[PDB]
Coordinates of C-alpha atoms and ligand atoms in Angstrom, one line a residue:
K1 CA 11.3 -50.2 -7.2
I2 CA 7.6 -49.4 -8.0
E3 CA 5.7 -52.7 -8.4
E4 CA 4.1 -53.0 -11.8
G5 CA 0.4 -54.0 -11.4
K6 CA -0.4 -52.2 -8.1
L7 CA -1.1 -48.7 -6.9
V8 CA 0.6 -47.1 -3.9
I9 CA -0.8 -43.7 -2.8
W10 CA 0.7 -40.9 -0.6
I11 CA -1.6 -38.3 1.0
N12 CA -1.0 -36.4 4.3
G13 CA -2.0 -37.7 7.8
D14 CA -4.5 -34.8 8.2
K15 CA -6.6 -35.9 5.2
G16 CA -9.2 -38.7 4.6
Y17 CA -6.8 -41.6 4.0
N18 CA -9.1 -44.3 5.4
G19 CA -11.8 -42.8 3.2
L20 CA -9.5 -42.9 0.2
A21 CA -8.5 -46.5 0.9
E22 CA -12.3 -47.2 0.6
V23 CA -12.2 -45.9 -2.9
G24 CA -9.1 -48.0 -3.4
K25 CA -11.1 -51.0 -2.3
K26 CA -13.9 -50.3 -4.8
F27 CA -11.3 -50.0 -7.6
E28 CA -9.7 -53.3 -6.5
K29 CA -13.2 -54.9 -6.8
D30 CA -13.9 -53.9 -10.4
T31 CA -10.3 -54.2 -11.8
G32 CA -8.7 -56.7 -9.5
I33 CA -5.9 -54.1 -8.8
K34 CA -4.8 -53.7 -5.3
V35 CA -4.6 -50.0 -4.1
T36 CA -2.5 -49.2 -1.0
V37 CA -2.6 -45.8 0.9
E38 CA 0.1 -44.5 3.2
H39 CA 0.8 -41.2 4.9
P40 CA 4.5 -40.9 5.6
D41 CA 5.8 -37.9 7.5
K42 CA 7.2 -34.8 5.8
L43 CA 5.5 -36.2 2.6
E44 CA 6.2 -33.1 0.6
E45 CA 9.9 -33.5 1.3
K46 CA 9.9 -37.3 1.3
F47 CA 8.4 -37.4 -2.2
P48 CA 11.1 -35.6 -4.3
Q49 CA 13.8 -37.3 -2.2
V50 CA 12.7 -40.8 -3.2
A51 CA 11.0 -40.2 -6.6
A52 CA 14.2 -38.4 -7.7
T53 CA 15.8 -41.9 -7.8
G54 CA 12.8 -43.6 -9.2
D55 CA 11.1 -44.9 -6.1
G56 CA 8.0 -43.8 -4.0
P57 CA 4.3 -43.8 -4.9
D58 CA 2.4 -44.1 -8.1
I59 CA 0.3 -41.2 -6.9
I60 CA 1.2 -38.2 -4.7
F61 CA -1.4 -35.9 -3.0
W62 CA -0.4 -32.5 -1.8
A63 CA -1.6 -28.9 -2.2
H64 CA -0.8 -27.6 -5.7
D65 CA 1.9 -25.3 -4.5
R66 CA 4.6 -28.1 -4.4
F67 CA 3.9 -29.5 -7.9
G68 CA 5.6 -26.8 -10.0
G69 CA 8.8 -27.9 -8.2
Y70 CA 8.1 -31.6 -8.8
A71 CA 7.3 -31.1 -12.5
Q72 CA 10.4 -28.9 -12.9
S73 CA 12.5 -31.8 -11.5
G74 CA 10.8 -34.2 -14.0
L75 CA 9.1 -36.0 -11.2
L76 CA 5.5 -36.0 -12.5
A77 CA 4.0 -37.3 -15.7
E78 CA 1.8 -34.9 -17.8
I79 CA -1.8 -35.7 -17.2
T80 CA -4.1 -35.6 -20.2
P81 CA -7.8 -35.6 -19.6
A82 CA -10.2 -35.6 -22.5
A83 CA -12.2 -32.3 -22.9
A84 CA -15.4 -34.0 -21.7
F85 CA -13.8 -34.9 -18.3
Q86 CA -11.9 -31.5 -17.9
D87 CA -15.4 -30.0 -18.2
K88 CA -16.6 -31.7 -15.0
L89 CA -14.1 -29.7 -12.9
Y90 CA -13.8 -25.9 -12.3
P91 CA -11.7 -24.0 -14.7
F92 CA -9.7 -22.3 -11.9
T93 CA -8.8 -25.6 -10.4
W94 CA -7.2 -26.9 -13.6
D95 CA -5.3 -23.6 -13.7
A96 CA -3.6 -24.3 -10.4
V97 CA -2.3 -27.6 -11.6
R98 CA -1.2 -26.0 -14.9
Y99 CA 2.5 -25.4 -15.2
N100 CA 4.2 -24.3 -18.5
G101 CA 1.2 -25.2 -20.6
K102 CA 1.1 -28.7 -19.1
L103 CA -1.5 -30.0 -16.7
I104 CA 0.8 -31.8 -14.2
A105 CA -1.9 -33.1 -11.7
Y106 CA -5.6 -33.7 -11.1
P107 CA -7.2 -31.1 -8.8
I108 CA -9.2 -32.6 -6.0
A109 CA -10.5 -29.8 -3.7
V110 CA -10.2 -26.1 -2.7
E111 CA -8.7 -25.8 0.8
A112 CA -8.8 -22.6 2.8
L113 CA -8.4 -21.8 6.6
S114 CA -11.4 -20.5 8.5
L115 CA -12.1 -19.2 12.0
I116 CA -13.5 -22.1 14.0
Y117 CA -15.2 -21.0 17.2
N118 CA -17.2 -22.6 20.1
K119 CA -20.7 -21.1 20.1
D120 CA -21.1 -22.1 23.9
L121 CA -18.0 -20.1 25.0
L122 CA -18.2 -17.3 22.4
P123 CA -21.7 -16.8 21.0
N124 CA -20.8 -14.0 18.6
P125 CA -17.2 -14.3 17.3
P126 CA -14.8 -11.4 17.0
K127 CA -14.8 -9.7 13.6
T128 CA -11.3 -8.3 14.2
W129 CA -7.9 -9.4 15.4
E130 CA -7.6 -6.2 17.4
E131 CA -10.3 -7.4 19.8
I132 CA -8.6 -10.8 20.5
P133 CA -6.4 -9.7 23.5
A134 CA -9.3 -8.2 25.6
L135 CA -11.4 -11.2 24.8
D136 CA -8.6 -13.5 26.2
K137 CA -8.3 -11.4 29.4
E138 CA -12.1 -12.1 30.0
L139 CA -11.9 -15.8 29.2
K140 CA -8.6 -16.2 31.2
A141 CA -10.5 -15.3 34.4
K142 CA -12.7 -18.4 33.6
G143 CA -9.7 -20.7 33.1
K144 CA -10.1 -20.5 29.3
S145 CA -8.4 -18.7 26.4
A146 CA -9.5 -16.9 23.2
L147 CA -7.4 -18.6 20.6
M148 CA -5.0 -21.4 19.8
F149 CA -3.9 -22.4 16.3
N150 CA -0.6 -24.1 14.9
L151 CA 2.2 -21.5 15.2
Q152 CA 4.9 -23.9 14.0
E153 CA 3.6 -24.0 10.4
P154 CA 3.7 -20.6 8.6
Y155 CA 0.6 -21.7 6.5
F156 CA -1.5 -20.8 9.6
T157 CA 0.1 -17.5 10.6
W158 CA 0.2 -16.2 7.0
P159 CA -3.3 -14.8 6.5
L160 CA -2.5 -12.3 9.3
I161 CA 0.8 -11.5 7.7
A162 CA -0.7 -11.0 4.2
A163 CA -3.6 -9.0 5.6
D164 CA -1.8 -5.7 5.6
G165 CA 0.5 -6.3 2.6
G166 CA 2.5 -9.5 2.8
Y167 CA 2.9 -11.6 -0.3
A168 CA 5.1 -14.4 -1.8
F169 CA 6.0 -13.1 -5.3
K170 CA 4.4 -10.2 -7.1
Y171 CA 1.9 -11.0 -9.9
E172 CA 1.3 -8.8 -12.9
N173 CA 0.3 -9.3 -16.5
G174 CA 0.1 -13.1 -16.2
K175 CA 3.6 -13.8 -14.8
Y176 CA 5.3 -13.9 -11.4
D177 CA 8.3 -11.7 -10.6
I178 CA 10.6 -13.9 -8.4
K179 CA 12.7 -10.8 -7.6
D180 CA 9.7 -9.0 -6.0
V181 CA 9.1 -10.8 -2.7
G182 CA 6.8 -9.3 -0.1
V183 CA 7.9 -10.8 3.2
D184 CA 9.6 -7.7 4.6
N185 CA 7.1 -5.0 3.7
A186 CA 5.5 -2.8 6.4
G187 CA 2.3 -4.8 6.2
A188 CA 4.0 -8.1 6.8
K189 CA 5.8 -6.4 9.7
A190 CA 2.5 -5.2 11.2
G191 CA 0.9 -8.6 10.8
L192 CA 3.7 -10.6 12.5
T193 CA 4.1 -7.9 15.0
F194 CA 0.6 -8.4 16.1
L195 CA 1.0 -12.1 16.4
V196 CA 4.3 -11.7 18.3
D197 CA 2.5 -9.3 20.6
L198 CA -0.2 -11.8 21.5
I199 CA 2.7 -14.0 22.6
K200 CA 4.4 -11.2 24.7
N201 CA 1.0 -10.4 26.3
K202 CA 0.7 -14.1 27.0
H203 CA -2.5 -14.5 25.0
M204 CA -0.7 -17.3 23.2
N205 CA 2.1 -19.8 23.6
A206 CA 5.1 -19.9 21.2
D207 CA 5.2 -23.7 21.4
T208 CA 1.5 -24.2 20.3
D209 CA 1.4 -26.7 17.4
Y210 CA -1.3 -28.6 15.5
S211 CA -1.9 -31.3 18.2
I212 CA -2.0 -28.8 21.0
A213 CA -4.4 -26.4 19.3
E214 CA -6.7 -29.2 18.2
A215 CA -6.9 -30.9 21.7
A216 CA -7.5 -27.6 23.4
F217 CA -10.2 -26.6 20.9
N218 CA -12.0 -29.9 20.9
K219 CA -12.0 -30.2 24.7
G220 CA -13.5 -26.7 25.1
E221 CA -10.3 -25.3 26.6
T222 CA -10.1 -22.5 24.0
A223 CA -12.9 -20.5 22.2
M224 CA -11.3 -20.3 18.7
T225 CA -9.0 -22.1 16.4
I226 CA -7.8 -21.6 12.9
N227 CA -8.0 -24.6 10.7
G228 CA -9.0 -26.2 7.4
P229 CA -11.9 -28.4 6.5
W230 CA -10.2 -31.7 7.3
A231 CA -10.4 -30.8 11.0
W232 CA -14.2 -30.6 11.1
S233 CA -14.8 -34.3 11.7
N234 CA -12.6 -34.6 14.8
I235 CA -14.7 -31.6 16.1
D236 CA -17.9 -33.5 15.2
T237 CA -16.6 -36.4 17.4
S238 CA -16.1 -33.9 20.3
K239 CA -19.8 -32.7 20.2
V240 CA -18.5 -29.1 20.7
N241 CA -21.1 -26.6 19.6
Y242 CA -19.0 -25.0 16.8
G243 CA -19.3 -22.5 13.9
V244 CA -17.0 -22.0 11.0
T245 CA -16.7 -18.3 9.9
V246 CA -14.8 -15.5 8.2
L247 CA -11.3 -14.9 9.5
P248 CA -10.9 -11.8 11.6
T249 CA -9.8 -8.6 9.8
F250 CA -6.6 -6.9 10.6
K251 CA -6.0 -3.2 10.5
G252 CA -9.5 -3.2 8.8
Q253 CA -8.6 -5.5 6.0
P254 CA -9.5 -9.2 5.5
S255 CA -7.1 -11.9 6.6
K256 CA -5.6 -13.5 3.5
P257 CA -5.3 -17.3 3.7
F258 CA -3.1 -18.9 1.1
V259 CA -5.6 -21.0 -0.9
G260 CA -4.4 -24.5 -1.8
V261 CA -5.9 -27.0 -4.3
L262 CA -5.5 -30.6 -3.0
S263 CA -4.0 -32.2 -6.2
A264 CA -3.1 -35.7 -7.2
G265 CA -0.1 -36.3 -9.4
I266 CA 1.2 -39.5 -11.1
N267 CA 4.9 -40.5 -10.5
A268 CA 6.7 -40.1 -13.8
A269 CA 8.6 -43.3 -12.9
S270 CA 5.4 -45.2 -12.3
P271 CA 4.8 -48.2 -14.5
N272 CA 1.1 -47.9 -13.8
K273 CA 0.3 -44.5 -15.2
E274 CA -2.8 -46.0 -17.0
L275 CA -4.3 -47.6 -13.9
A276 CA -3.5 -44.4 -12.0
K277 CA -5.4 -42.3 -14.6
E278 CA -8.5 -44.6 -14.3
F279 CA -8.5 -44.5 -10.6
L280 CA -8.3 -40.8 -10.4
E281 CA -10.7 -40.1 -13.3
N282 CA -13.4 -42.8 -12.9
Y283 CA -13.1 -43.6 -9.2
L284 CA -11.9 -40.7 -7.1
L285 CA -13.3 -37.7 -9.0
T286 CA -17.0 -38.8 -8.9
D287 CA -19.8 -38.1 -6.5
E288 CA -19.1 -41.6 -5.1
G289 CA -15.4 -41.3 -4.5
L290 CA -15.2 -37.8 -3.2
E291 CA -18.1 -38.4 -0.8
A292 CA -16.1 -41.5 0.6
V293 CA -13.0 -39.4 1.3
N294 CA -15.1 -36.4 2.5
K295 CA -16.9 -38.6 5.0
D296 CA -13.5 -39.4 6.6
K297 CA -12.1 -35.9 6.7
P298 CA -13.9 -33.2 4.8
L299 CA -12.0 -32.0 1.7
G300 CA -13.4 -28.4 1.6
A301 CA -14.8 -27.2 -1.7
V302 CA -14.2 -30.1 -4.2
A303 CA -13.1 -29.5 -7.8
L304 CA -15.9 -31.6 -9.3
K305 CA -18.8 -29.4 -10.4
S306 CA -21.6 -32.0 -9.7
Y307 CA -20.5 -32.6 -6.1
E308 CA -19.7 -29.0 -5.2
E309 CA -23.3 -28.0 -5.7
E310 CA -24.3 -30.2 -2.8
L311 CA -21.4 -29.2 -0.6
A312 CA -22.2 -25.5 -1.5
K313 CA -25.3 -25.4 0.8
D314 CA -23.2 -26.2 3.9
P315 CA -22.4 -23.0 5.9
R316 CA -18.9 -24.4 6.7
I317 CA -18.1 -24.7 3.0
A318 CA -19.4 -21.1 2.2
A319 CA -17.2 -19.9 5.2
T320 CA -14.4 -21.7 3.3
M321 CA -15.2 -20.0 -0.1
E322 CA -15.5 -16.5 1.5
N323 CA -12.2 -17.1 3.2
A324 CA -10.8 -18.3 -0.1
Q325 CA -11.9 -15.4 -2.2
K326 CA -10.6 -12.9 0.3
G327 CA -7.2 -14.7 0.1
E328 CA -5.0 -15.7 -2.9
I329 CA -4.5 -19.0 -4.8
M330 CA -1.0 -20.1 -4.0
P331 CA 1.6 -19.9 -6.8
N332 CA 2.7 -23.3 -8.1
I333 CA 6.2 -22.1 -9.2
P334 CA 9.3 -24.1 -8.0
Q335 CA 10.6 -21.0 -6.1
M336 CA 7.7 -21.5 -3.6
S337 CA 9.5 -23.9 -1.3
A338 CA 12.2 -21.1 -0.8
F339 CA 9.5 -18.7 0.3
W340 CA 8.1 -21.3 2.7
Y341 CA 11.5 -22.3 4.4
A342 CA 12.3 -18.6 4.8
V343 CA 9.0 -17.7 6.4
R344 CA 8.9 -20.8 8.6
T345 CA 12.3 -19.7 10.0
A346 CA 11.1 -16.1 10.5
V347 CA 7.8 -16.8 12.3
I348 CA 9.4 -19.4 14.5
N349 CA 12.3 -17.0 15.4
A350 CA 10.2 -13.9 16.1
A351 CA 7.7 -16.0 18.1
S352 CA 10.3 -17.7 20.2
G353 CA 12.0 -14.3 20.7
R354 CA 15.3 -15.5 19.0
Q355 CA 15.1 -12.4 16.6
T356 CA 12.8 -9.4 16.4
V357 CA 10.0 -9.3 13.9
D358 CA 12.3 -6.9 11.9
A359 CA 15.5 -9.0 11.8
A360 CA 13.3 -12.0 11.3
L361 CA 11.6 -10.6 8.1
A362 CA 14.7 -8.8 6.8
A363 CA 16.4 -12.2 6.8
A364 CA 13.4 -13.9 5.3
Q365 CA 13.3 -11.4 2.6
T366 CA 17.0 -11.7 1.7
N367 CA 16.8 -15.5 1.9
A368 CA 13.6 -16.2 0.0
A369 CA 14.8 -14.0 -2.9
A370 CA 18.2 -15.5 -3.1
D371 CA 16.9 -19.1 -2.7
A372 CA 14.3 -18.3 -5.3
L373 CA 17.0 -17.1 -7.8
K374 CA 19.2 -20.0 -6.8
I375 CA 16.4 -22.4 -7.8
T376 CA 16.2 -20.8 -11.3
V377 CA 19.9 -20.6 -11.9
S378 CA 20.3 -24.2 -10.9
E379 CA 17.7 -25.4 -13.4
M380 CA 19.6 -23.5 -16.2
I381 CA 23.0 -24.8 -15.2
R382 CA 21.5 -28.3 -15.5
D383 CA 20.3 -27.3 -19.0
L384 CA 23.7 -26.0 -20.0
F385 CA 25.8 -28.8 -18.6
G386 CA 23.5 -31.7 -17.5
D387 CA 26.0 -33.6 -15.3
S388 CA 29.6 -33.0 -16.3
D389 CA 31.5 -32.4 -13.1
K390 CA 31.4 -28.8 -14.2
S391 CA 27.7 -29.1 -13.6
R392 CA 27.8 -30.7 -10.1
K393 CA 30.6 -28.5 -8.9
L394 CA 29.0 -25.3 -10.1
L395 CA 25.8 -26.3 -8.2
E396 CA 27.7 -27.2 -5.0
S397 CA 29.2 -23.7 -5.1
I398 CA 26.1 -21.7 -5.9
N399 CA 24.3 -23.1 -2.9
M400 CA 25.4 -21.6 0.5
Ligands
LIG1 O1 3.3 -24.0 6.3 C1 4.0 -24.5 5.1 C2 3.1 -25.4 4.3 O2 1.8 -24.7 4.0 C3 1.0 -25.5 3.1 O3 0.8 -26.8 3.6 C4 -0.5 -27.0 4.2 C5 -1.3 -27.9 3.2 O4 -1.5 -27.2 1.9 C6 -2.7 -28.2 3.8 O5 -3.2 -29.2 2.9 C7 -2.6 -28.8 5.2 O6 -2.0 -30.1 5.2 O7 -1.8 -27.9 6.0 C8 -0.4 -27.8 5.5 C9 0.6 -27.1 6.4 O8 0.5 -27.7 7.8 C10 1.7 -25.6 1.8 O9 0.9 -26.4 0.9 C11 3.0 -26.3 2.0 O10 3.7 -26.4 0.7 C12 3.8 -25.5 3.0 O11 5.1 -26.2 3.2

């Protein structure tokens, strides 16, 4: 089901796959081992689906936030770098791929959203979200708009929602409290309420997705977008005079992007775990490998110490780091997917006017907390009963 003697790799359509294939070709040339790169859709859902029955890729690339849930499902192999190699990467990056004492992936890069603006339309960019509406009024009269960014994917809206108090799970004394969810606080209400208002005041469209925001920005139709470093190269092709900067503050407080570490995990069912380790350690995570991917779509602020000191001088990276320190490193816990489904439903509903901000978040709060708990209970019931019918038929029930 996974061919012994070859490497298949999954990484998302927005990332430097053609650049990674290049690294795959170099590997193939020293070791004779063919490396194949693919980007199926809904990768982060497609992976556990197929790997759960022993198929899928030898290697899986996603942000570190999904990996806790994969490791917990027994889907990843433990990764075991020698001290000397661990040393070449930033402590905090290893930390985000650490789950229950075990490293469960290789950290590749630090990804954070920034405000991307067109210097020709908007020479000085807004420092605040509260100035965006007025700005749009003025651009509208020129057949232009202030801002478009993907509203379909809560990853994008979230730094506004967190700005005044939203959070996934509370973090104190080294552990997460999956019973303390921060999606329906007053601050998360204010944040979404502002976003929803921009829609009501027709300063944005509820349908705006990733394609639509990217085409509009890169064609000069809109003065601002919110996007991660992978988007920079398409904008370079456009020749649009752009800057990458700090996100606008809301109610006076910085916007809080969820920070992701692009990680690479080995499929626990892979019969090429040794080849997979050599490709990631001696080929990808080098000045050579990273630069090959980064040339295709920029990775952000790479894990590897030696190559980050070059990338660090770039103002678009610094903008990334400043956005990143103002935000929070995503949790990697299994209950995270529950937080994301619930918030995806909420933003979508309040934006499309299907529910108010308040009924939207009230339901997101209930649902994230219950799905979170459900994820934990389910694990334990598997520990108590493995797969006696008592096990399957208790799970069946508990989920509804
Ligand atoms: O919005 C839900 C989604 O947010 C994050 O996914 C990001 C990803 O980390 C980035 O690498 C880039 O591809 O944008 C994605 C969303 O469009 C979370 O990592 C992901 O788990 C979550 O479902």
